[PDB]
UniProtKB/Swiss-Prot annotation, chain A:
<dbReference type="GO" id="GO:0005634">
    <property type="term" value="C:nucleus"/>
</dbReference>
<dbReference type="GO" id="GO:0140236">
    <property type="term" value="P:translation at presynapse"/>
</dbReference>
<protein>
    <recommendedName>
        <fullName>Large ribosomal subunit protein eL22</fullName>
    </recommendedName>
</protein>
<feature type="modified residue" description="Phosphoserine">
    <location>
        <position position="50"/>
    </location>
</feature>
<dbReference type="GO" id="GO:0005840">
    <property type="term" value="C:ribosome"/>
</dbReference>
Curated annotation (Swiss-Prot), chain B:
<dbReference type="GO" id="GO:0098793">
    <property type="term" value="C:presynapse"/>
</dbReference>
<dbReference type="InterPro" id="IPR002675">
    <property type="entry name" value="Ribosomal_eL38"/>
</dbReference>
<keyword id="KW-0689">Ribosomal protein</keyword>
<comment type="similarity">
    <text>Belongs to the eukaryotic ribosomal protein eL38 family.</text>
</comment>
<protein>
    <recommendedName>
        <fullName>Large ribosomal subunit protein eL38</fullName>
    </recommendedName>
</protein>
Swiss-Prot record, chain D:
<dbReference type="GO" id="GO:0005829">
    <property type="term" value="C:cytosol"/>
</dbReference>
<keyword id="KW-0832">Ubl conjugation</keyword>
<feature type="modified residue" description="N6-acetyllysine">
    <location>
        <position position="42"/>
    </location>
</feature>
<dbReference type="GO" id="GO:0005840">
    <property type="term" value="C:ribosome"/>
</dbReference>
<feature type="cross-link" description="Glycyl lysine isopeptide (Lys-Gly) (interchain with G-Cter in SUMO2)">
    <location>
        <position position="107"/>
    </location>
</feature>
Curated annotation (Swiss-Prot), chain E:
<feature type="binding site">
    <location>
        <position position="57"/>
    </location>
    <ligand>
        <name>Zn(2+)</name>
    </ligand>
</feature>
<feature type="binding site">
    <location>
        <position position="54"/>
    </location>
    <ligand>
        <name>Zn(2+)</name>
    </ligand>
</feature>
<comment type="function">
    <text>Component of the large ribosomal subunit. The ribosome is a large ribonucleoprotein complex responsible for the synthesis of proteins in the cell.</text>
</comment>
<dbReference type="GO" id="GO:0002181">
    <property type="term" value="P:cytoplasmic translation"/>
</dbReference>
<dbReference type="GO" id="GO:0022625">
    <property type="term" value="C:cytosolic large ribosomal subunit"/>
</dbReference>
Length: 101, 69, 50, 114, 89
RNA sequence: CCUCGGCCGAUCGAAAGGGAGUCGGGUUCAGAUCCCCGAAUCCGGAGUGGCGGAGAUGGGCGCCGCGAGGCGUCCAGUGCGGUAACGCGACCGAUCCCGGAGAAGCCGGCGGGAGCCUCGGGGAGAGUUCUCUUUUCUUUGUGAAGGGCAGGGCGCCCUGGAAUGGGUUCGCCCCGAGAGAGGGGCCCGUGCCUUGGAAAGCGUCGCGGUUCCGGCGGCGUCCGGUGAGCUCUCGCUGGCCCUUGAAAAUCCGGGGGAGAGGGUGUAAAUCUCGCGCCGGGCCGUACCCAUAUCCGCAGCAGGUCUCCAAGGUGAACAGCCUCUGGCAUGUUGGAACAAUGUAGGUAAGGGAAGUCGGCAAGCCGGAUCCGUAACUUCGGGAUAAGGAUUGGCUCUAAGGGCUGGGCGGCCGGCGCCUAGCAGCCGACUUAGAACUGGUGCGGACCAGGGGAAUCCGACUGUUUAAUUAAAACAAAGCAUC
RNA sequence: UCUGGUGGAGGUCCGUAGCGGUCCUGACGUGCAAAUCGGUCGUCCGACCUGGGUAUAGGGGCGAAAGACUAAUCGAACCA
């Protein structure tokens, strides 16, 4: 009854334009459980990273479109919406890809 | 379209000289055997894969068989 | 209108076929006096007897 | 909101231009032209206000492609008279015939004795 | 609700007081439901002028224009019974 | 040749009346419920039976057969079930007769269903991110025809016998001519599931060949809640009428029983049952449908019959702003901002002194709470007249629905829901209060000035299309011939 | 008899669409128009508005009556 959602940042980190560690702290700080930011909702939601693959797990109702809202805000803050887009490559994962010609 | 709930009735419909083709479709939950006749398309819904493979072997000879893959 | 009889349609067919310009070789015929089709009918300008 | 158009050349809201809304497998809303509502037979008695039971309420010309059982009730005067008035005519026929025999016997006995 | 206008309050001031008074009597009788003499139920309404219907026994009777029984009808029925009885006895 | 036999008379008359039967997906530069794909359906024909099923295959007397089951004879059989309402797949039948459907007004009020709008979440894509917003926008299917189940309706049936009258609607209305209660029956079923059906359509992410392959592939097309909401439609029940709101083709049911069938075969006549075979000819179909395809001499501010109808404000299909869709300002542009004009405003102090005349303009205007005269045909006059309030914000009180009542059950005294308690769910208002702004608040939009009298016509209605809308005409009532 | 509800009548009132056409004697008046335009107005469940089909033809028709209308023509149309 737990929800596992993942985020792929392989391409941006290979190019060096993205910091995976900076993403962890952004999602750790600017994330809400029951409308309150910080503290990860008393530890109910957790974030892990492994090789630029940020996984978010929770047991309370948690929607991955909320994460797409958060990653878009991260990209805009870092001036990356002009080269990167967030695409659902699976049922439970998003992936950061470039714009083709 | 008519829904047939018996295998014995399906074999009778398939062996009709009116019958033209048997179309087998595989879904996530069932397999549907469809026999096209002059007036109605007779569909048989089978939820067991073991019985589904048996029906393919017992289909009458000569009748066209198409797999909707 | 779209709803029309066979008699009316055949009448409109004939007026359509006779609304053509004069052929060019007619001017070259010996003793020719026709310079243009003086019976040309435009749909917006002149209406049919029907 | 998607707006609709007539599928036929009749542009007037007549009794034969009635339509309903149907959603297609193409996720479009279209007009479907509906048949008129049929009425079940009214009893031949002339006093019962309600319709007959057991008979399909369809338009008259469709009535000829139904089976006979859908058009009648298994009883004398089945699909033409109600049960209540069929009962009354059985009793009315019997009781009047009984009175006629009584009257004939009474007039025959009176004639013989007078 | 009203002092005297009764059922002809629907006409307001639009006709004379005397004309509204005359039609008041007729409109009460033409819309009243009478007791049916055949079934005993008080359901004898008026279909049209001279036509009276009972909604329980489904009997239609020819009556008066606004009242179920006209006085001329009652006198004639009683007179015909007298003339018939004189013929018989 | 007998028998039957009323045409109660030819024929014409509706592309809005009646009138069997088709709907999804794709396809064009322009066609399409018409072409292709798919799934259906009506009518007509089938003689020389197209195949099944039904009719229709029982009983008695014996004999043999261990007995089952067979041999002979005789007699049935134009189906069957339910107390009933009626039901089942068919379930013979002519002249003749009866009936039904086609086939009925307008208005009101309720209820059911659908479409649309709305609200809470979950996906996919997009917009914004200067700060916030877990946000804002889009999208989130299942045709006809069958089968099943909800749901709606019923003056349909059976038991039974009601006053201490009861049942019940928003209103009514119903009952010893049979209420309430219980149990059934029928009709409609445009709703849901299902066959059709996901293979197709749409969304999104990729991979191909080449101008097109309905290319190929992955994932999805989800779960709920509301309502006097609007529209359509199906019902129920009322009101009005000195107004009672088509006809005929066509189809069906019933009454009767003239006839037909076969003698016990594995049979007959017959069959409105299931499937199978063949056909459906003729004409119309493009497009405009109007501030540019029609009429007005024209691309003419005129005229010309309909259908569908989103968000916000608000009583509203009012006016004002917006979305889907559409457009280019209405047969030209540039510059300037004179007089006179057309259209729209404002004005100190007076306040009709103007003028034939308050013409024109202006005042009033919504809603809530108070308060309303003379006169009167007692209905009205009446929004008479006159007065107060109206914003924003933060609260308070009241107004409802469902479920429950001493691993899973239950044979049980052992429990007692009873000043209606607990939990869960939910929308729209009303009233009161505090605070607050340069007293501003129906802030735009929408939106009656009023009173005292005289003349005429009673009122509503009508009239000189293109100078007269009136006191003229009509009208109900009265009277006369 | 009075009171509070319910109910939803009416050639009922305000007022949209529709139908009509008061006043400005406004605009225009070689017009957009051989009768139109704007504001303001009357009515808006009824003696209501409207399409198609039908019937009545010129000393005739039709007229809730103005000598009105009868194809821009009416105190007897138009055509020869
Ligand atoms: Zn009666």
């Amino acid at each position: 009854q737990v929800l596992k959602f993942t985020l792929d940042c392989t391409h941006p980190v290979e190019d060096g334009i993205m910091d995976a560690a900076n993403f962890e702290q952004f999602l750790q700080e600017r994330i809400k459980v029951n409308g309150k930011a910080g503290n990860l909702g008393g530890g109910v939601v957790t974030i892990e990273r492994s090789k630029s693959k940020i996984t978010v797990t929770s047991e309370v109702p948690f929607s991955k479109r909320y994460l797409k809202y958060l990653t878009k805000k991260y990209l805009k803050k870092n001036n990356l919406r002009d080269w990167l887009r967030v695409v659902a490559n699976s049922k439970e994962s998003y992936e950061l890809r470039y714009f083709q010609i | 379209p008519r829904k047939i709930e018996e295998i014995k009735d399906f074999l009778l419909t398939a062996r009709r000289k009116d019958a033209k083709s048997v179309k087998i479709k595989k879904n996530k939950d069932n397999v549907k055997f469809k026999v096209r006749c002059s007036r109605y398309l007779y569909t048989l819904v089978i939820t067991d894969k073991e019985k589904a493979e048996k029906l393919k072997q017992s289909l009458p000879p000569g009748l066209a068989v198409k797999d909707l893959k | 209108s779209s709803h029309k009889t066979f008699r009316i349609k055949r009448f409109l067919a004939k007026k359509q076929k006779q609304n053509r310009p004069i052929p060019q070789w007619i001017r070259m015929k010996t003793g020719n006096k026709i310079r243009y089709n003086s019976k040309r009918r435009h749909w917006r300008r002149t209406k049919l007897g029907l | 909101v998607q707006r609709l158009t007539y599928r036929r050349r009749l542009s007037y809201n007549t009794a034969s231009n009635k339509t309903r809304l149907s959603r297609t497998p193409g996720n479009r809303i279209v007009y479907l032209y509906t048949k008129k509502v049929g009425k079940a037979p009214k009893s031949a008695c002339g006093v019962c206000p309600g319709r007959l039971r057991g008979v399909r309420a369809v338009r008259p010309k469709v009535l000829m492609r139904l089976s006979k059982t859908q058009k009648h009730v298994s009883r004398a005067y089945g699909g033409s008279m109600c049960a209540k008035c069929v009962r009354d005519r059985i009793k009315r026929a019997f009781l009047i015939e009984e009175q006629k025999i009584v009257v004939k016997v009474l007039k025959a006995q009176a004639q013989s004795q007078k | 609700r009203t002092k005297k206008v009764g059922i002809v309050g629907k006409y307001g001031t639009r006709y004379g007081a005397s004309l509204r008074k005359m039609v008041k009597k007729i409109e009460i009788s033409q819309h009243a439901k009478y007791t049916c003499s055949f079934c005993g139920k008080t359901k004898m309404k008026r279909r049209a002028v001279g036509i009276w219907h009972c909604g329980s026994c489904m009997k239609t009777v020819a009556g008066g224009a606004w009242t179920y029984n006209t006085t001329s009808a009652v006198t004639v029925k009683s007179a015909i019974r007298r003339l018939k009885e004189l013929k018989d006895q």
